[PDB]
Design an enzyme around this catalytic site. Structure first.
Site, PDB file in Angstrom:
ATOM      1  N   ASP A   1      12.408  -9.416  -2.089  1.00 45.65           N
ATOM      2  CA  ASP A   1      11.327  -8.735  -1.358  1.00 45.65           C
ATOM      3  C   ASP A   1      11.037  -7.380  -2.011  1.00 45.65           C
ATOM      4  OD1 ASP A   1      10.226  -9.603   1.780  1.00 45.65           O
ATOM      5  OD2 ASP A   1       9.815  -7.561   1.103  1.00 45.65           O
TER       6      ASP A   1
ATOM      7  N   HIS B   1       8.853  -3.304   3.930  1.00 44.44           N
ATOM      8  CA  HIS B   1       8.829  -4.734   4.231  1.00 44.44           C
ATOM      9  C   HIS B   1      10.205  -5.365   4.037  1.00 44.44           C
ATOM     10  CE1 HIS B   1       7.454  -8.991   3.495  1.00 44.44           C
ATOM     11  NE2 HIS B   1       6.515  -8.672   4.368  1.00 44.44           N
TER      12      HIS B   1
ATOM     13  N   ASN C   1       0.358 -16.440   6.196  1.00 40.36           N
ATOM     14  CA  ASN C   1      -0.426 -15.813   7.267  1.00 40.36           C
ATOM     15  C   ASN C   1      -1.931 -16.011   7.112  1.00 40.36           C
ATOM     16  OD1 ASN C   1       2.089 -14.663   7.983  1.00 40.36           O
ATOM     17  ND2 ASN C   1       1.546 -12.714   7.014  1.00 40.36           N
TER      18      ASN C   1
ATOM     19  N   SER D   1       6.493 -13.756   7.626  1.00 41.22           N
ATOM     20  CA  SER D   1       7.524 -12.968   6.965  1.00 41.22           C
ATOM     21  C   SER D   1       8.638 -12.522   7.906  1.00 41.22           C
ATOM     22  CB  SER D   1       6.919 -11.704   6.360  1.00 41.22           C
ATOM     23  OG  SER D   1       6.259 -11.968   5.136  1.00 41.22           O
TER      24      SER D   1
END
Ligand SMILES: [Ca+2]
Length: 279
Positions: A39, A69, A161, A224
């Site tokens: 990530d 994130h 998404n 996520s």
């Protein structure tokens, strides 16, 4: 073990019904497993990680999460307060820059990097990878996910998404890994969850409280945020002896709460990740 007034998603994956706020779980809590968060990095200094998190790779000029994130995902996996698997070892792999974005070739590089590195780590109970990222179908990105999985790592990936069928997105469409959609605290599919027969499972993804940089917390939303609930859960199940890195996506599906989400389009699984502790 019980943790009262828990983020709602940790209570959900320990409940048959929505609407409660305690997280019921066995205290072994993922001891002896490991999870790679691939990530923007992990602010390992966040006391919520208590010394169990390490960056171990970057493809950019610093290994720090300068976006938050990666730190939020990782917190859901394994922070003391907001995590599933509160005693797992975390490992960071910074493939995304600080705005969030990553080229496919570097994301590929960081995925092969885990299949190798796990051999440099102490993970007696199993090894997981959590990918809260993606972009359009690529055979190559998908292939790098099958390799990582094949190498004996449980791979959990965000379905995506857009509300779109995920078979057009990678690494989600890769069939051999565990593609995760998002739900909300009232058991609705989250409005942004991709859907499609390539999903294996849903986890909590809408208003997920977790860690953020600066020692801090926030609630954000996505497939996520759903992804690291399944990754942490699989770490928890390895450790308990219920399943293995190669068997965990099937085990989670077998033991899921079955029927219970509303708006599963036709053809998409209606399976919600459950820890099978309190009942
Ligand atoms: Ca699968």
């Amino acid at each position: 073990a019980a943790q009262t007034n828990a983020p709602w998603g940790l209570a959900r994956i320990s409940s048959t019904s929505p609407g409660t706020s305690t997280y019921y779980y066995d205290e072994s809590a993922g001891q002896g497993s490991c999870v790679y968060v691939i990530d923007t990095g992990i602010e390992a200094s966040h006391p919520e990680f208590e010394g169990r998190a390490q960056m171990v790779k970057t493809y950019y000029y610093s290994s720090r999460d300068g976006n938050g994130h990666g730190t939020h995902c990782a917190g859901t996996v394994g922070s003391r307060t907001y995590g599933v698997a509160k005693k797992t070892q975390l490992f960071g792999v910074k493939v995304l820059d600080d705005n969030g974005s990553g080229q496919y070739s570097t994301i590929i590089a960081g995925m092969d990097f885990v299949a190798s590195d796990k051999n440099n780590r102490n993970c007696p109970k199993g090894v997981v990878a959590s990918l809260s990222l993606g972009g359009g179908y690529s055979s190559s990105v998908n292939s790098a996910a099958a390799r990582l999985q094949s190498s004996g790592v449980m791979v959990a990936v965000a379905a995506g998404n857009n509300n779109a069928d995920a078979r057009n997105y990678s690494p989600a469409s890769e069939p051999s890994v565990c593609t995760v959609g998002a739900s909300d605290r009232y058991d609705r599919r989250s409005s942004f969850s991709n859907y499609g027969s390539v999903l294996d499972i849903f986890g909590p993804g809408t208003d997920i409280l977790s860690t953020w940089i600066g020692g801090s917390t926030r609630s954000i939303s996505g497939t996520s945020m759903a992804t690291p609930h399944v990754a942490g859960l699989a770490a928890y199940l390895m450790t308990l002896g219920k399943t293995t890195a190669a068997s965990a996506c099937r085990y989670i599906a077998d033991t899921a709460n079955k029927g219970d989400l509303s708006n599963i389009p036709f053809g998409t699984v209606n399976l919600l990740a459950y820890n099978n502790y309190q009942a």
